[PDB]
Structure formats: structure tokens, C-alpha cells
Amino acid sequence: AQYEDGKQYTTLEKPVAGAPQVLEFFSFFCPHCYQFEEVLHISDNVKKKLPEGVKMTKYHVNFMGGDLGKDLTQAWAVAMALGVEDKVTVPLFEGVQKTQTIRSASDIRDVFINAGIKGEEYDAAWNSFVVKSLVAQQEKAAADVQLRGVPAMFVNGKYQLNPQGMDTSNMDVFVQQYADTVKYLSEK
Amino acid sequence: AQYEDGKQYTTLEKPVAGAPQVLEFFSFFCPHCYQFEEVLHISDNVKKKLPEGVKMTKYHVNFMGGDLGKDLTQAWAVAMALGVEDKVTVPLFEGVQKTQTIRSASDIRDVFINAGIKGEEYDAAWNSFVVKSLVAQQEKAAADVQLRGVPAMFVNGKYQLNPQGMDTSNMDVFVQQYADTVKYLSEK
């Protein structure tokens, strides 16, 4: 469709170098993020329209939910390291917001075990160098873009999507306008 | 020495006479208020520990959300007048922050109708002078304590909770610590 700077997206004053092509930030404590994931399927729709060779990166943030927010960022790194994102994303969102069975770090471990991950493997991953590095990358990425809130999506480390300037009257149209904006920006 | 001024609570420079025993302020637009209510359940837990005869009052504020902010204060007045607070709190918080489908006074009305309140019953209360007095009461209480931010909780019109002086690694322990402090302050 037609896109205007300052409307469907905004340009960053300081372009982050080496940033992932499409970077999405979220928090398991974030209500609207739960909506984006479970109901709207924003990520899935954006993926369907992305050109060949463009990869989507999704990072968890620390600034929500206090000290537990930090543990979730580490648990997300474990999810990425084990490659079980699609198995634990909804269960974690529900555990924190819906059923409220996740009140501390040990509860996060149970979610993974329930998904079929061995406890020994989870524990080893939790303390791994790979995970400690991933936690560092996530925290740094947020700092580089001076992230103030979630959900958020950045393209080529230069643009940031602005759903507030998008047509929200019809949710099906909205989702497609969002995905089309990402696609348009990824080739700019 | 266990509970100190400046620590888990602060004392008001100018105490409010005639203020409700436990007064909580919030806004449906306030992110931390969503956490407090939907995830932590602060109000419920505090109620469960208050002495016999100590009543809790919850008021909405105007300083967030602009136009819609004031509409929500009037709608909260309607919820109070009709005694349907427990029916509309969740859908209002979710409507504003989770689904972001609440964009005008009409959308707020839809929430009440869907909750079971009759259209004519809602419209009558909405335009009633009883509701206008409830709005004035809410505004007055905020003015009395020079409220500049939410969430906020006051006890006996003298003390204001300071959640910043407590651990948030375990939500259940934080909640219980918050509730215990309110109880302490109420019998002080």
C-alpha cells in the first residue's frame, strides 16, 4: 500500500549497526504482547510475507515484572538455545498471565519439563555459556535501540514499526497492513 | 525498626482528615495498575488481611488517557453506583490494555452491556447526578493527597505505601509483604 515516515513507522536517529534484519521485543508480562501472539498471530503473518533470506529474531525484555522479568529473559535464552520456542511460548504466556502458575524461577522450569525437556538438560542449558551470551545479546539489543516499551519491532536497525498510525478498525486488515509494512521496510 | 518511614511507606506532610480507611487510586491506562490488579491481585490480598470494620475504597483518576481517561472515571462512578465493580474491572483493563478495543465512550458502554447491565439502566446512571457526585468525590480525594501518579494506596489518610522498598523476585512474597504493611499501618 502507501507508507509515510512518522505514520506506519518511524526512523531512528541513531541506526543500530549489525542489528538483526527483523527484531521483535516482547515480555511474558506484557498483555498486548499476549494478544499479538495468541489472537492476532502477528509474527506468523509477518513471516509469511517476508522475502527470501530475511530472518526474524524475537528477544525478551527485562523491564517488566521485576526480578522475575530477568529470569524470564534467561528462560527465553534457554528456549532459543534448545530450539523449543514454539513449544513454550504460549504455556509461558498463560502461566504468567492466565493461570498464574508461574510465580518464581522454579515454576518456569516445570513448563519446560512438561514440554518434554529433561530437567538435567534444562539445568545444564540454564548455566551454559551460550545462554549467558544470549542474555547479554538481548539486554544489549534493547539498550542499542533505547527501548522504552513492548511490543516493538525494528527493521534493519533503522526503522521502528508504529501500529498506532495503522488502520485498526478491521483487525484482519490491520494484521496485513502490519506485515506489509515490515516487508516494505525490509527492502528499503 | 522493622517498618520505617521512608522505607515501606512514607508519611504525608499534610494528613487528610475524613479520608477512607484504605484508599487505592488507579487508572485503566496504567500498566503497573494492570499488573497490580490482574496478575498480583493486590486489592484482594489486602482485603483478606484487613481488620474487621476496615473498608477499602478504590478510585479512578483523570490524569492518564486524556479524553478517554475522564470517560473511564465516569464509567467507574457508574460501576460503583450500580455495584458492578467485580463485573467490569477485568474487561475494562483488558479492553484498554490487552485488546485495545476500547477507543470511545461507546466502547466502554459495550463492556457494561456485555457484562449484563441493561442499556437503559446504564444510560440512566451515566447521566445521573448521583454519578456526577461520585465523579466529584473521586476528583476531590485525589486533590486532597496531591496525587501525581498511580498505582497508589493510602491508609487512614496519613500513610502512603512505598512498594519500591520490597523484593519482587517472588510475586507471592511481595504481595504478602504489601498486605502485611497495610494491616500494620491500619492498626497504627
Curated annotation (Swiss-Prot), chains A, B:
<comment type="function">
    <text>Required for disulfide bond formation in some periplasmic proteins such as PhoA or OmpA. Acts by transferring its disulfide bond to other proteins and is reduced in the process. DsbA is reoxidized by DsbB. Required for pilus biogenesis. PhoP-regulated transcription is redox-sensitive, being activated when the periplasm becomes more reducing (deletion of dsbA/dsbB, treatment with dithiothreitol). MgrB acts between DsbA/DsbB and PhoP/PhoQ in this pathway.</text>
</comment>
<dbReference type="GO" id="GO:0071236">
    <property type="term" value="P:cellular response to antibiotic"/>
</dbReference>
<dbReference type="GO" id="GO:0030288">
    <property type="term" value="C:outer membrane-bounded periplasmic space"/>
</dbReference>
<dbReference type="Pfam" id="PF01323">
    <property type="entry name" value="DSBA"/>
</dbReference>
<dbReference type="InterPro" id="IPR013766">
    <property type="entry name" value="Thioredoxin_domain"/>
</dbReference>
<dbReference type="GO" id="GO:0003756">
    <property type="term" value="F:protein disulfide isomerase activity"/>
</dbReference>
<keyword id="KW-0732">Signal</keyword>
<protein>
    <recommendedName>
        <fullName>Thiol:disulfide interchange protein DsbA</fullName>
    </recommendedName>
</protein>
<dbReference type="InterPro" id="IPR017937">
    <property type="entry name" value="Thioredoxin_CS"/>
</dbReference>
<feature type="domain" description="Thioredoxin">
    <location>
        <begin position="1"/>
        <end position="131"/>
    </location>
</feature>
<keyword id="KW-0676">Redox-active center</keyword>
<dbReference type="InterPro" id="IPR036249">
    <property type="entry name" value="Thioredoxin-like_sf"/>
</dbReference>
<keyword id="KW-0574">Periplasm</keyword>
<keyword id="KW-1015">Disulfide bond</keyword>
<comment type="similarity">
    <text>Belongs to the thioredoxin family. DsbA subfamily.</text>
</comment>
<dbReference type="InterPro" id="IPR023205">
    <property type="entry name" value="DsbA/DsbL"/>
</dbReference>
<dbReference type="GO" id="GO:0015035">
    <property type="term" value="F:protein-disulfide reductase activity"/>
</dbReference>
<dbReference type="InterPro" id="IPR001853">
    <property type="entry name" value="DSBA-like_thioredoxin_dom"/>
</dbReference>
<feature type="disulfide bond" description="Redox-active">
    <location>
        <begin position="30"/>
        <end position="33"/>
    </location>
</feature>
<dbReference type="InterPro" id="IPR050824">
    <property type="entry name" value="Thiol_disulfide_DsbA"/>
</dbReference>
